[PDB]
Amino acid sequence: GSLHMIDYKEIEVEEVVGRGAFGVVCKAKWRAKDVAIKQIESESERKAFIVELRQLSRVNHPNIVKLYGACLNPVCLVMEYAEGGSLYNVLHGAEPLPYYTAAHAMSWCLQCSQGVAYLHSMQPKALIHRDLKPPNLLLVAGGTVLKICDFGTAGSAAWMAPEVFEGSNYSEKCDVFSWGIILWEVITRRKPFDEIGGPAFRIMWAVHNGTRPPLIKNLPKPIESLMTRCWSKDPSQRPSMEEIVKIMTHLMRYFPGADEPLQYPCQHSLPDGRVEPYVDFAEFYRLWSVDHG
Numbered sequence: 502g503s504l505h506m507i508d509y510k511e512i513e514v515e516e517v518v519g520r521g522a523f524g525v526v527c528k529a530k531w532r533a534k535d536v537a538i539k540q541i542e543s544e545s546e547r548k549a550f551i552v553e554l555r556q557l558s559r560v561n562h563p564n565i566v567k568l569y570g571a572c573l574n575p576v577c578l579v580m581e582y583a584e585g586g587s588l589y590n591v592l593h594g595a596e597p598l599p600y601y602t603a604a605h606a607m608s609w610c611l612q613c614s615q616g617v618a619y620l621h622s623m624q625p626k627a628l629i630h631r632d633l634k635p636p637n638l639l640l641v642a643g644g645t646v647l648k649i650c651d652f653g654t655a656g657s658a659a660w661m662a663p664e665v666f667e668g669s670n671y672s673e674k675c676d677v678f679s680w681g682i683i684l685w686e687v688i689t690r691r692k693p694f695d696e697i698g699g700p701a702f703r704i705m706w707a708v709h710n711g712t713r714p715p716l717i718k719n720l721p722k723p724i725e726s727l728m729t730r731c732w733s734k735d736p737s738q739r740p741s742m743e744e745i746v747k748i749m750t751h752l753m754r755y756f757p758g759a760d761e762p763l764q765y766p767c768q769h770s771l772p773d774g775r776v777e778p779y780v781d782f783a784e785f786y787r788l789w790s791v792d793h794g
């Protein structure tokens with residue numbers, strides 16, 4: 502990992518794009534390249550700054566946002582920027598919402614699993630993301646490429662494995678838990694545990710007591726098994742990210758069309774115990790029976 506020392510005085514700051522898990526983030530120019538700059542808000546995030554910087558220096562992967570360097574005066578991170586938006590916004594955010602397909606859904610989760618598998622394989626110690634959730638996953642290239650962001654950690658109750666907020670010892674399997682919640686979220690286009698709401702502790706209570714998102718009607722059993730094993734209480738029962746990536750990869754053959762940009766408009770009604778999926782599985786069943794006949 503080789504980061505550039507960058508001189509802030511050759512950075513042309515533009516509009517604020519949003520504020521991450523920590524910090525504020527702004528679009529900008531630098532050497533005539535569009536970039537995103539992340540500045541410490543109040544120096545209460547100077548822990549979370551030196552954290553994100555130290556680990557992001559090591560990492561180089563297509564599905565993780567590439568750090569270009571940092572500045573000393575003032576102290577700020579400099580990341581690649583591209584047109585797009587958070588997975589969160591795409592799923593749930595400002596109308597009109599874009600239409601997406603099962604393929605988009607499965608591709609988003611495969612690409613997340615790829616980026617996290619990379620992190621878990623880091624030597625000599627695994628990087629645990631530990632704040633995986635749709636607000637920290639960026640969609641780019643017409644909503645087709647997903648990039649992981651926001652490593653400040655090293656709002657999240659809904660995605661968070663029970664053992665992490667139990668105060669316990671936890672491992673890279675905390676991520677696998679989050680991954681599964683997310684898989685459920687892209688399939689359903691619903692916010693996990695939104696019906697519960699309250700404040701955070703009501704969700705924590707619920708999950709700690711074994712509550713999980715509801716099962717999905719008509720969901721292919723192979724997807725149902727992956728998802729619910731990701732959600733197991735016992736972290737040793739959850740699959741490795743490498744297993745996931747292999748399973749998702751093999752699954753994609755029944756989900757052509759990941760590479761279509763999000764271009765079509767959608768207005769979707771939002772209806773319990775077994776929810777309907779937002780994406781459609783009919784084509785998957787068709788393709789599956791074709792291969793298995």
Ligand SMILES: CNC(=O)CN(Cc1ccccc1OC(F)F)C(=O)c1c[nH]c(C(=O)N2CCCC2)n1
Nearest residue numbers: 518519521537582583585586587636637638639650
């Ligand atoms: C409509 N979009 C939004 O509501 C907010 N974002 C995403 C965004 C902002 C701040 C922090 C993380 C973000 O995305 C994702 F990481 F969750 C953006 O607009 C955006 C667009 N491109 C980018 C980008 O390239 N980034 C590089 C890492 C920080 C954001 N962010």
